[PDB]
Each structure stands twice: as structure tokens, then as C-alpha cells.
Amino acid sequence: EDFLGCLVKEIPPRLLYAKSSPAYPSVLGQTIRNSRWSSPDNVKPLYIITPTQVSHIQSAVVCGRRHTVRIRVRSGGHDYEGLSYRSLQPETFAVVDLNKMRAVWVDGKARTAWVDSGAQLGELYYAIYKASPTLAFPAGVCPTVGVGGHFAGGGFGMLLRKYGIAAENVIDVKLVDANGKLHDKKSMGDDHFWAVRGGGGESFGIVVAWQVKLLPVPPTVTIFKISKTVSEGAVDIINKWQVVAPQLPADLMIRIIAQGPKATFEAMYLGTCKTLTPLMSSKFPELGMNPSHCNEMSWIQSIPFVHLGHRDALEDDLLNRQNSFKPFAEYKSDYVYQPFPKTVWEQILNTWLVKPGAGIMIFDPYGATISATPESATPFPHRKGVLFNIQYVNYWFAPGAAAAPLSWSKDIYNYMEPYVSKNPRQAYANYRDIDLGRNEVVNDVSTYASGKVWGQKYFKGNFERLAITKGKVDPTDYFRNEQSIPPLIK
């Protein structure tokens, strides 16, 4: 009652939603991306606040502290476990939903931009394009992902070999801390500014906006998508890829998608077909690339082309808030440091990807710029020595059909254990997976020991620094979820 009373005192009431508000179901659902988490059995927020100004965010946080109601912040809603808008067990929380805070102000000459956290990646990319056809920003492949959660968790895409992760191309932030105080890099200090850029969402406060550096790209880039079935030699070709791809020049990234006994090699090359063709013949002739495979286009056009295979619908693909795609979805991830034996590739392609409920596997090669950053330089630790990341993606489209895909996801993770990183088994924070472990709360504070179990998987040797920083900026564990950094205090 009095939390709401506090809010109503400080924030326009049209931006406040209670469970009985006519628009509450629509507002809650607008950026839910996973049909597992939209159904009525999920724990729902007591209130939703949709700020349009930073002062609204500050007021909400102050009210939450005064009245001990915790807040889960949502930007784009893509959290794989829905932790921006649901809790796992019954509890009281509000959602602060930033979708109305979505401005992207580009300074083309300075090669910087201020990007509100509620902007989607496609809007960031498009605004850069409206300023220049030869500037880019290295973030993810999915246009509807929110800036806020993506940057907080690191963020990587088809420019990761050239420029690293999104969070390491952030030069300032505007942030509201657990006390409602507005911060930037200077006021935050080294530890807090280190942590917020890749240490995971929620834990380190609400980032309102991010200042980014913009990076040059050639006026023409080249994409190819070359598939090989097992009959066409996929096993031998992927067995070569895993050694070659992380060693290729920074201008060339060749990822793989597999969803049966066939691998699709998807490349983005910062250059022309004319130079790509001989590069491929020299470094990876086994793929059989020739100029007919080239698709030359602008960098901005590569975003819909890579993700959707579209060539012709730039605005529709990048400026999309309809939320039409809502699979039931499960996700896992791994990091690989040692090449798989050929027999493991055989099993993956011929056996694991031909099972009931089998998902898709996406393999992103590292090396080059992402791997040149030291493991501790940012919270994202998956750097030197990484050959590739694996994402295991399971989509399905019927309620009551979760058993088979969920079992497959668990079973393949067990199969892969001997071949991927260990001690700890590394995972990417933005590919959130609650089965890696969850927090225990004691005396209303997430415990350090429970956080460490999953935290070392996402953050390796950076976990303790994250937790000490958490203890300094939020000792009472105000901004938390089931898998957020616990405070480590004296």
C-alpha cells in the first residue's frame, strides 16, 4: 500500500501499473520473449513502473528502499530465465521497465553515442547508420535485445573478433545505485565501473544510459553462408575449422550453426569478395568457398542478413517492437579450449542433433581481439585460449511439450562435459542458465557461498572482485535476483 503511495507521490500515475490495472497484462507481456515465462503460473510483479525520465527511476528506487520492496529492472526482456520480470518462487517485487527510455544520440564526428538502456540493439545500430554508413558498434546479432541487459552481461556478436565485447567499448555510463544516487564513471570509481561493464545485469544498479565508442567498418562487408552435410565432409571440415577459425585474421569471423547432420558456416568479413576469396583459399580451402558464395552489403545490412537471411527490409527488421516471436525456450552454453576429437564431432552431428527434442548448436570462434584482453581486465573472463563458445538453443511452440527438449538440453550437457572447460565449467552470463546454480538468501542477503557456485562459471577468477564491489555499492543486497552477485562485506 505505502510503496505504491510513495510512487504515486513522485511519478506520473500513468506510468504505474498494479495487477488490477487494465493495461498491466499487456505491459508485463510486451517484452517477454519466452513462452515458458509468460503463463499464469509464473510469479508476477506487484507493480510495474515504466519511467520516461531518470528522475522517475531515482524516485522508484528511493521508494523501494524506504518501503523495502525490491525491484527487478527490465530493458529488452530477453533474459533467458525471465529474471527481469519474474521470480522463481513467490515473493514481492516491482518491475522497473525501461522500454520508454530508448533514445540513441550519435555524435558521428566524435565517434561516440549515448544509448538509453531501453533501446533495442536494432535501434542502436540503425541510429548509427543514420549518422554514418561506415561506423559500427560490436554487439549482438538479435535486433530486439535490450541494450541494458546485453551490455551489463558483456554482449558479443559478429564483430567480436575485431573489437571484443560490447561492454569493453563502453566509455561512460549514467547509473542509479541502490540508494537512488545518480552516478557516472567518475563518481563510481574503478571497481564499480569495472563491474557494471560485464558483471551481469541487476547486481550493480540500474544503468540508465551507456556512452559508447563507435568503430570504423568498411563501406562494403561480405557475408557467406556455406552448408556442408556429413556426406559433404562436415566432420572433417568442422574438425579443421576449430583450429583455423580462432587463428584467422581479425577481419574474418566464421561462426557455425548446426541442427542435424549438417553444419552451416556463416562468415562476416570486413572487406570485399575480391580479397576474401584468396584469403579463404589460403587459410581454409577445405570449406570450398568461391566468389558465388559472397554477399556484399553495408555493415547495417549485415545485421538483418546474418540473423534473418533478409536482404531487403532494413527498417522493418531493425525497428521492431511487435514482439511476434515467443518460443518456449531453453538455453545452455560452454567454452572450449582444446580441440574436440573427430569422434566427438561425429557424435554431435550424427547422433546428438538427431534426437527427440534436439536443439540447435551455435559455435562462435574467439581468438584475435576478444582473446587479447586479459581475463581480469573486465568481468568477462572467457578470453585467451578460447577456441570457441557453444550455445545450445532449444525452441518449441506448444505448451506441455517441454519434457523432451529439457531432457535433451541436460543430456547433451552431460555428454559434452569431458570436452569443454572445467574447474570451473565456464558459461556466458548473458546465456543465463539457472541450472548452473542459484543463490540462497539468509537474513535477507544472498550468500557468498551460494553465489560462488554459478558465479565462478560466468566470471571465473573475477567473481570475488565482483562480490567485494557488490558489498561496497549494495551491502544490503537490494538489487538482486536468484543469480545475482552476492555482497562480500567485512
Contact region with Cl ion (CB under 5 A), list: 37-45, 72-80, 236-244, 339-347: 72-80
Instruction: Name all contacts of 182-185 with Cβ < 8 Å and 24+ positions apart.
Output: 182/54, 182/58
Contact region with ligand FAD (CB under 6 A), list: 152-160, 284-292, 368-376, 450-458: 152-160
Could you give the string, one character per residue 110-139, with x where binding to ligand FAD holds by CB under 6 A and - elsewhere?
-------x----------------------
**Interaction between residue 423 and Na ion (CB under 5 A):** yes
Binding ligand FAD (rule: CB under 6 A), the pick from 45, 51, 64, 77 is 77
In this structure, what C-alpha cell is assigned to residue 400? 506441455
Reference 482, options 431, 430, 443, 447; nearest CA is 447
Closest contact distance (angstroms) between CB of 482 and Cl ion is 13
Q: Label residue 218 exposed, middle or buried (CB < 10 Å: 0-12, 13-18, 19+).
A: middle
Q: What is the DSSP letter of 445?
A: E
Closest contact distance (angstroms) between CB of 257 and ligand FAD is 12
Closest contact distance (angstroms) between CB of 83 and ligand FAD is 5
Whether the CB-CB separation of 313 and 143 falls below 8 Å is answered with: no
**SS3 of residue 109 by DSSP:** coil
Interatomic CA distance for residues 311 and 385, integer angstroms: 35
Binding Cl ion (rule: CB under 5 A), the pick from 382, 432, 460, 480 is 432
**Interaction between residue 470 and ligand FAD (CB under 6 A):** no
Q: What type of residue is 151?
A: F
**Interaction between residue 140 and ligand FAD (CB under 6 A):** yes
Q: What is the DSSP letter of 350?
A: I
**Interaction between residue 324 and Na ion (CB under 5 A):** no
The per-residue b/e assignment along 4-34, b for 16 or more CB within 10 angstroms, e otherwise, is: bebbeeebeeebbbeeeeeebeebbebbbbb
Interatomic CA distance for residues 471 and 486, integer angstroms: 8
Whether the CB-CB separation of 300 and 135 falls below 8 Å is answered with: no
β-sheet bridge partners, residue 174 = 209
Query: CB under 5 to 8 A by kind: which of ligand FAD, Na ion, Cl ion, none does 423 bind?
Result: Na ion
Interatomic CA distance for residues 1 and 7, integer angstroms: 10
Q: Which is nearer to ligand FAD, 239 or 333 (CB)?
A: 333
Contact region with Cl ion (CB under 5 A), list: 169-177, 295-303, 319-327, 428-436: 428-436
Q: Which is nearer to Na ion, 282 or 423 (CB)?
A: 423
Cα torsion through 429, 435, 437, 443, rounded to 10: 110
Could you give the string, one character per residue 349-388, with x where binding to ligand FAD holds by CB under 6 A and - elsewhere?
----------------------------------------
Interatomic CA distance for residues 28 and 60, integer angstroms: 17
**Interaction between residue 75 and ligand FAD (CB under 6 A):** yes
Contact region with Na ion (CB under 5 A), list: 200-208, 224-232, 285-293, 417-425: 417-425
Binding Cl ion (rule: CB under 5 A), the pick from 32, 61, 79, 176 is 79
Binding Cl ion (rule: CB under 5 A), the pick from 3, 17, 37, 80 is 80
Binding ligand FAD (rule: CB under 6 A), the pick from 79, 123, 177, 317 is 79
Binding ligand FAD (rule: CB under 6 A), the pick from 61, 69, 98, 188 is 98
Q: Which is nearer to ligand FAD, 72 or 382 (CB)?
A: 72
**Interaction between residue 486 and ligand FAD (CB under 6 A):** no
Whether the CB-CB separation of 52 and 185 falls below 8 Å is answered with: no
Binding site for ligand FAD (CB under 6 A): 33, 72-80, 83-84, 98, 117, 140-142, 145-146, 148-150, 152-153, 155-157, 201-202, 206-207, 430, 481
